[PDB]
Each structure stands twice: as C-alpha cells, then as structure tokens.
Amino acid sequence: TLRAAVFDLDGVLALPAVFGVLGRTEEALALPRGLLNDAFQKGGPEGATTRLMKGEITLSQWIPLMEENCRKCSETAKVCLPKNFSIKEIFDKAISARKINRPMLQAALMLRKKGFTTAILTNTWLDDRAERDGLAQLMCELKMHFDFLIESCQVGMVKPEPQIYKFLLDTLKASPSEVVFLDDIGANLKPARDLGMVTILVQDTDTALKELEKVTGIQLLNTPAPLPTSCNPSDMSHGYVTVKPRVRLHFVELGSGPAVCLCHGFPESWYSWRYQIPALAQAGYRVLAMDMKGYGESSAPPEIEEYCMEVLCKEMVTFLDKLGLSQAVFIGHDWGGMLVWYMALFYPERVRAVASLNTPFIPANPNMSPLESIKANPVFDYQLYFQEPGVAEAELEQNLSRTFKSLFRASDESVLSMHKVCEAGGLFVNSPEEPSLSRMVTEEEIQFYVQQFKKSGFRGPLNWYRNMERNWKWACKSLGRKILIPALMVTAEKDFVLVPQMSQHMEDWIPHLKRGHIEDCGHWTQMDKPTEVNQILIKWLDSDAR
Amino acid sequence: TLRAAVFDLDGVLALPAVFGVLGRTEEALALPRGLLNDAFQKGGPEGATTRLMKGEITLSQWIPLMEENCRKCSETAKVCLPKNFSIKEIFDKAISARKINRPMLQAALMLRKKGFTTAILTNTWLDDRAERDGLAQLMCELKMHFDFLIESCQVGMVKPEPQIYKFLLDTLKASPSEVVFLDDIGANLKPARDLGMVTILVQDTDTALKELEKVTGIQLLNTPAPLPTSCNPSDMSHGYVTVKPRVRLHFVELGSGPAVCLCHGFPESWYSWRYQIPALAQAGYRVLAMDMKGYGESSAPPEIEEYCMEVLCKEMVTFLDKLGLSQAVFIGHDWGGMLVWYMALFYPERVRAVASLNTPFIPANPNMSPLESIKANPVFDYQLYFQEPGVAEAELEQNLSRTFKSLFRASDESVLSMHKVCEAGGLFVNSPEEPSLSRMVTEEEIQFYVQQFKKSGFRGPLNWYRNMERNWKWACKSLGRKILIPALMVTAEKDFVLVPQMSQHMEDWIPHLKRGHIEDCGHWTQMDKPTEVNQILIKWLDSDAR
Numbered sequence A, B: 001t002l003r004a005a006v007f008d009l010d011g012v013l014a015l016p017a018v019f020g021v022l023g024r025t026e027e028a029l030a031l032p033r034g035l036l037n038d039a040f041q042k043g044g045p046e047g048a049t050t051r052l053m054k055g056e057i058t059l060s061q062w063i064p065l066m067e068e069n070c071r072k073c074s075e076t077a078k079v080c081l082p083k084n085f086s087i088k089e090i091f092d093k094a095i096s097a098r099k100i101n102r103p104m105l106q107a108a109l110m111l112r113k114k115g116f117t118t119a120i121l122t123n124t125w126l127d128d129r130a131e132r133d134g135l136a137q138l139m140c141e142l143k144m145h146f147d148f149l150i151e152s153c154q155v156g157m158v159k160p161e162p163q164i165y166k167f168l169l170d171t172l173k174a175s176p177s178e179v180v181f182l183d184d185i186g187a188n189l190k191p192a193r194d195l196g197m198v199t200i201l202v203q204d205t206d207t208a209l210k211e212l213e214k215v216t217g218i219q220l221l222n223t224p225a226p227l228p229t230s231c232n233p234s235d236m237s238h239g240y241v242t243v244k245p246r247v248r249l250h251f252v253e254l255g256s257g258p259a260v261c262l263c264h265g266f267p268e269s270w271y272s273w274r275y276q277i278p279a280l281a282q283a284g285y286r287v288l289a290m291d292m293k294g295y296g297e298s299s300a301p302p303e304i305e306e307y308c309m310e311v312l313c314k315e316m317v318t319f320l321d322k323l324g325l326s327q328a329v330f331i332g333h334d335w336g337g338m339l340v341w342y343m344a345l346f347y348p349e350r351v352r353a354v355a356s357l358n359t360p361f362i363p364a365n366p367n368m369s370p371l372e373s374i375k376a377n378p379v380f381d382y383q384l385y386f387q388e389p390g391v392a393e394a395e396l397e398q399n400l401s402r403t404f405k406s407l408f409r410a411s412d413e414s415v416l417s418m419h420k421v422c423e424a425g426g427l428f429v430n431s432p433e434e435p436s437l438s439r440m441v442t443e444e445e446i447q448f449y450v451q452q453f454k455k456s457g458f459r460g461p462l463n464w465y466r467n468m469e470r471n472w473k474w475a476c477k478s479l480g481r482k483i484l485i486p487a488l489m490v491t492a493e494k495d496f497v498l499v500p501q502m503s504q505h506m507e508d509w510i511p512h513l514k515r516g517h518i519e520d521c522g523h524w525t526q527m528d529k530p531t532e533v534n535q536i537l538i539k540w541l542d543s544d545a546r
C-alpha cells in the first residue's frame, strides 16, 4: 500500500538543523531561553519568517527584520543583546554547519530503488547572501536522488498550512494512505496525519529509520554499504569536439573545478567511469569522461595508423585546445592508462597530474622489437591474436552480449583463460554461449555497451593494438626523460594480465610516484571496486592536483 | 609570390625574450658579462641546452645541468656565483615575464586574413615545472591564430640545423621564395636565407613590421584597431543537455574558471556571442553560450506555454543541475536579458552574478494588464504584431536572408521603423527585397543564422512574446523582493526600443546595481560594439564575480 516517502530537509535529510542553532546560540551567549526562537516566529502567519518561507522576500531582506524582532523580544524580556550580536553571522555559520545526514539519504535511496516515489518537502528561503553557493551545493547534492523537491519559497505555501499537503499529494499522484512522511517538527506532521498519511516524528535518525523500516517492511538500517552513485546516460551533458576533418570526440561532462579527463581501456566506454563520474564532480572537479577514438559516439576511422599513440595523444591535445583548456588531470585505465603516461611524457605542460589504473609505465626497450617483447609473456598472447585485421573483429562482433558478459567479470568469476589464445583459435573458444551475469553488472548495463558497439564494432578499438612498431619507435624518443609531474599508479591485486609486479620498477622513471593498491580487485577496476577507486582518486587529486 | 609568413616565439611573438633575462640577470647580479649565456650554450650541438630543445630531456632535468654549466664557467672566469643563485628561480620569473607582443600577433592575423599561410617555428622545451601552466596558457592563446606551430622539442630538430627548415617548407607546402621568415637571432635566419626565403631580423617590433609591410605590400602598421577574435562554429565544443523528455538544450563551451552562461535575444543564436566567447575564456572564465529554447540546435516544442518565463527559468535551473553546476554568472541580451533578471529574482542561490545588455528590469505593474502596458509605448507595437499565431511566422520565414539582413543593422543603417507595425501589416512591408549587407556582418555570418532558422523557424522564438499574462502573474509574486546579488546593467545609446531612459529607476529594485553605457551602439549590442562590450564585461566579472 505505501508507495511514496517524503522527507523534510532541516533535521531530517540534513544535520544539525538551524532551529537548533537558535537554541545553541541562546545558550552560548547566555540569552533568555527561547528568546531567539520567539523573534524567529514573531507574528506567526503574518510575520517576517513566513513571508521569507513563502518567497515574498529574500534571505537578505529578512535579516534586518529578524534583527528588529530580536531587539523587541529583548526589550520586553528586559535583557540586553550582546555587543556584536549578529543574525547574519549566526545564520551564515548555521547554514554552513549543516551537512547531509547520510543514513537518511541512504534510506531514501533504498526506498527509491525498491520502487518508492521519493520527495523532499521543505520550508526554505530564497538565499541571496554572499555565501549562498554553500546551500546551492547541498541542494544539488541532495535533490538528484529524489523524484521531487518541493520548496516552500517556490510554491508560495508553507508547512503546516494544509494546502501544501494537497499540493504534495497532487505532485506525488498518490493518495494520503500511500504516503509516509517524516519531519522533525510535530506540528508539521499533524496535517499529514489528518489526511491519513503515515507520519514519523524524527528525533535521532536510527529510531525514525526503525519506524520507517517497520512501516514499509524494507530493510533500511544495518543494510550493506551501498555502491557509489551511477550515471544515467540520458541525464548527462554530452559534448562533442571535432579535432580534425574526419574525427570528432564525444565526452560526458559533470561538475566544476580543475578539469579531470577520464580515459577508458579496451573494449570499453565513457560509461566505464559511471561510478567515478558523480563522486569526482561532488569532490570539486570538472569531469570529462571520454569515448576514446574508435568508441561509442567518437569517430572510428578504419585505418590502423589513426590509432598509433602519437596521433591519439596529438588529438587529445587538440581536444584541450578546442575546449580552451590549458591543462587537465589525465586519469586512465588499461589502454587509456598507457595513453596518459604518454601524455605525461610528451606534453607535460598540458597535464596537471597523471594517474593510471592497472597499466604500468614500462619504457620501450630500444634493443628488443615490441613483437618479440610481447612473445616474452604468455599472458600477452591475446595481443598477437589481435594483430590480423578481421580475425578478432569477427569473434568479438559475432555476439555482443556474450562478448561483454564474458569479459566483464570479477576475478573469482573468470570464464576466459588468457592462455594460448592463438593456439585455441579465439578468446571465447572455450567459454559459454550464454554466460551468466557478473555480480559487477546489471543486464541493462551490459546492453548499453552492446548498443554502443553496434555503431562501429571492434575495428577501431582493435587498431589500438596494431601499432606496436610505430609506438615503439616513438616511445624510444622519450628514453632520456623522466616524469616529474604529479603521478599516481593504482595496482589491482587480481588483474592477471596487468599484474601489480609489472609496475615494480616504475620509480626509476617516476621518482616521486605515488601509489594505491586494491585488493581482491580484478581487471575491470572501476566497476569491481568503485568505492575504493573513488577514495584513492579523490584523496590523490585533493593532495596533488589542487 | 609571397604566400607564407613564419614567426619565432621568443623575441618575436612574445616579449621580453629569455636570452635577455640571462643578460639582465648577469647585470642585476654583477656577474661577468656573457657568463650565463656561455653556460646556456655550453657544449654547442652536444650540450645540455640542445638536448633540451630537441625533446631528449625535460626542463626540470635540464635545470641542474645548467647549474653545473654555470659553476664550471664561474670557476674558469675565477668569480663566485652569488649565495642563493638559482636557475629555477631565474627561469621561473623569465618565463612568467614574457607576454604576447600584440603588434606582431596583429600583423600575423592581418597577413592570415589576406590569405597567408602562417606558422610559428620555435626552439622550445618540454616544460614540467610546477609553474608550467603559465606557458601552456601563452601557447594556447597564440597557437589558435596560426596554421601551424612547429616546436623543436616535438620534432627532434632545432634552429639553425638545416633539416628543420626543410621540415618547415614541407609543412607549409610552399617553396622557399614564397616564405618570409622573422627571427630575433641572425644565425637562425642564415639557413632560411640560403634557401632563398625573405628573412627579417627582428630588433624593435615596428622596424620589422616596416620591413614586413614593404616586402608583402600589405598594411600592417598603423592599421585600424581590429575586431576581437570570432568563433568558427565547427571548431567549438558543442554540448547537449536533456532538461526533460521533449527538450534538449544546446550550448557552445569554451575556457575554464567560474561558469558564465550567455543568453541571446530574439531572433538570435549562441553565435550572437561570437565576439565575446574567446575574450571571456581568455579572461579566465568558463563560457557556456546557449541556443535558448526555440533556437538553433535546442528543442523547439510548438506549444505557447513551453515558452513562459517560469518554465524557461526552471529549465535553465535543470541545465545547471545536469551539468553539476551549483552556480553560473548569467549574462543576457534582449529576451535573454529579461530571463536573467528573472533568474536573479527566483533563483538567486543559483546566480553568481547577473548582467543584462539593453534589457532593463521593470517590475510588473500589479494594476495594469501587460497588454494594456504594452499599448502605452508606440515603439512596442511590434509586440502586438507578434501575438497572433502564424502571422509573424509567415513574414519572418518567407525569406530568411532578407529577415536577418533587415534586422541585423547598425543604428545609422536602419531600414525598419518600429512605428505602426500592425497598421502597416508587417515588420518589412516597407523595406527592400534584397537589403544591403550591414557593416556589422559578413555574408557568411548572415547565412549561419539562415541555416540555423531552417531547423525550426520562428514559432518557438515568437512564442517567447506570447505569454504576457502568464509572465505578469508570475512576476507579481516577486514584487516584495529586491535583487541584492551582484548586477550589471549595460545601456546602448541608440537602441530605439530598449532605450537607456527605460532603465532609469532600476536602483529602486537593485540598489547596488553597476552600469556601463555604450555610445553609438544600436540594438545588436554584441556585434555592433564587441570591443567595448568585452571590456565592460571582463572588468565587471573580475571585480564582482571573482
């Protein structure tokens, strides 16, 4: 029967509440108990604060009204306000003090995931203070997780007036007995209750979640640790830049602050960074998640040499130029990892910082041809399989579902040995027709990649492996150099190809190199361990790219 | 015969040159004359500096090599280097000291405009210093104006080695006698001269321009003040955001730093900001130039109410939300101007600063219906003409060329009175079939707008005028408020509709309002006076949005 959950903001989705800054201030300053609260509510439905909450006047216009209220209350209470008493100051601090109550957001997220319509209904104000960005940020971080946000000052109504609850019901398209509504103010519950809504009086969070959990019959408390926020492809800003006549690059873009350019591996997509994109934006960065050349909505010319590193890097430079970016932080995985190390080596003026997941930096060997080098590691045999134009294409294109469902698997779920791929005749010769779904991905996610690869298939992506000689000769030019810009290498314990030991000599070429290491993590790092990837990246960005 | 011009960077396109920081430093510090220069060149083709300029080693690797050179030179000159002597320090300062030599860039721009292929050919380095962004910025600002930039450290060759000039010729696809090449170092000219290139030894800029002007037969010196940099539509990053199921907004995006969202008027385009887009990026801002709803590559639903202010503003808010932007600066012109004032009034938490060109803020009159209000000004008659769906569409769509060529004219070139448009039967009933081209626009520019309006025509744009009652009622909600965030109103002397006197009472509603005023400037502000618009905006952004 319950179909919808509605949350207040102050004291429910965000803590501490401001009403409790009035109380704390009165104490701190030894003012009569309740004095500030009395000034706040002065005049009831006709007072300054209701005008504020209804959108009639802005925060800044209200501040001196509260001021006057406070003087009038202190005069009748026959006390003096303290020299330097300041409403602006009290509220500035209160508004910046208040953070998202994570357990409550997590319970709302959970209810939405099992099918609840969720809404935030709040008494709030039009904030024109110099410091208003703070609150704008909070509301953005919160509102994205909900079906609706109803704000008193946008609708001209306030809790507890009954018309707002009618407006709520109509927005939900639900009847009162389908709604649970949580608030920290009992008078605000009363009208919800009159209509027959389940209402929860929120004091400490855990008790309200207990009541919410009992009343919905869904686990909300003690639940396992949830994944980071993912990206819905059709809610993203999509960007397109032509870097030369036949080639346009596509990217998804989110957030503001230093530019951070994300470069995926083979055979992937911008969407491989779906767990990192909202977290890095949230952390104060401008994320640009690419489709690399050959993929998704980026161009995919047929010719092998279009995909050598030299050209790929020059095109990434052109990308910054057309976007008007003097630098970006470059973070890559797998092939995207090899590329960013090259950006570091050939265009350090354009790289604010560099990081790689899985892909080590190993200088080219000027004496050994890369083909020969490759034969020296049984686990790189798949690379030789990939050389002959057409062969890997036909296997990889034959059944896209099975391709992604076979590749994208956690380390304890593998279905492809990387062993003697050439001899076997294929990458999948000995894996199922219909693979089971990895714990790492939903069916919908597999299908996005399938739809992406329907545009150009595997020729462009495979081409990235078909320039071993050209990249070797180019890389040899850089053997005298070191990487001396900020740099982060992230190893993944259970990547059986890019093993962590392959990265061991990196400090000889990158002496100030920083590291993270992720246990129990296979090759598809970003989706296998998205929580730990995000922590290691944000911590490194904040300390080394900021 | 001369088809190509080639410029050096240090001492030609950028001043002061660094070689002249070696000289200045020796003086400043009372070291033997030439000592630093000797350490710099130590070892000639095999020395640290040639390795640097060839890309073998990075700037940071080079610094201690120069150091050692300097010690060895001071030992043989039997002098002491000064306590705290520091190469890193000397070059940090030198590299940040050096700016674009504007008269030289302006001469290159001019030669390119009359058909020269232009190139920058420079001895430079792979810069990995903590401060490398400085140089990255300079190179970006410079390189966009040229056909090629050839860098010693990317090609593995250096001036004066002859192979670089051969590489130059091949890049130009020109023969030596078609090339003028300018350098401040005579030894670098010598090989150009051996091949039969016109060469110019650059000491003071003006003399070299005199020689360049005589040798090309094109005026370069004393030329009139050029326009700001414009945008080539196909070199821009194009962005797309879906704000709700039927509506996607298109924008062009350039630069990094605080977000600045540009909102054009009727019947315009993102491209109306082509003169401001490169200047504001260059000034340290992230520009987002919209196609507003109804225009260009943004969606254009048929229904009138899709274009009322309330919906338009909510959709702009959604736009920030999906881009992950807590705020943008909003700068509008004409209709875009009315909109940004509404963003200021209804979402001040989301507006970092607001500016309008031409469009004043005039509070809705709660006693007078807006239709009646509109009849009160003979020069708003065109607004009534625009009400009847279909009528203005048919006139405006009939001949797109003539539409834009009639509208887009400077104030002394007008062809349409705004007088009794209804009575006359149209906006163009008494203007030419084939109008002449305004000084403000080239034929190509008129045609971009024509191509844009071929996608959706004039229904969506006209709709912006068809919600006078709905916007009035909405605007009445805001009559108690003031705008107290930073705000800039720009009047244009010769706009005969949005006259400057219409803005006179603005300080009653916006008490800290700043102003600029542009003389001799008609309605199409951004293109009529792009240089003065840019100065007034950058100066206001830098002081009020920063």
Ligand SMILES: Cn1c(N)c(N2CCCCC2)c(=O)[nH]c1=O
Pocket (backbone or CB within 6 Å): A266, A267, A382, A407, A414, A416, A418, A494, A495, A496, A497, A498, A522, A523
């Ligand atoms: C299971 N696995 C795995 N499939 C890969 N591939 C990445 C994509 C191309 C083929 C190899 C890897 O690099 N490391 C692994 O551990």
Ligand SMILES: Cn1c(N)c(N2CCCCC2)c(=O)[nH]c1=O
Pocket (backbone or CB within 6 Å): B266, B267, B382, B407, B414, B416, B418, B494, B495, B496, B497, B498, B522, B523
């Ligand atoms: C010449 N002129 C002019 N055409 C306009 N229009 C803008 C576009 C819609 C019709 C009116 C104006 O607002 N001010 C002017 O001075």
Ligand SMILES: [Mg+2]
Pocket (backbone or CB within 6 Å): A008, A009, A010, A011, A012, A017, A183, A184, A185
């Ligand atoms: Mg509350």
Ligand SMILES: [Mg+2]
Pocket (backbone or CB within 6 Å): B008, B009, B010, B011, B012, B017, B183, B184, B185
């Ligand atoms: Mg020079």
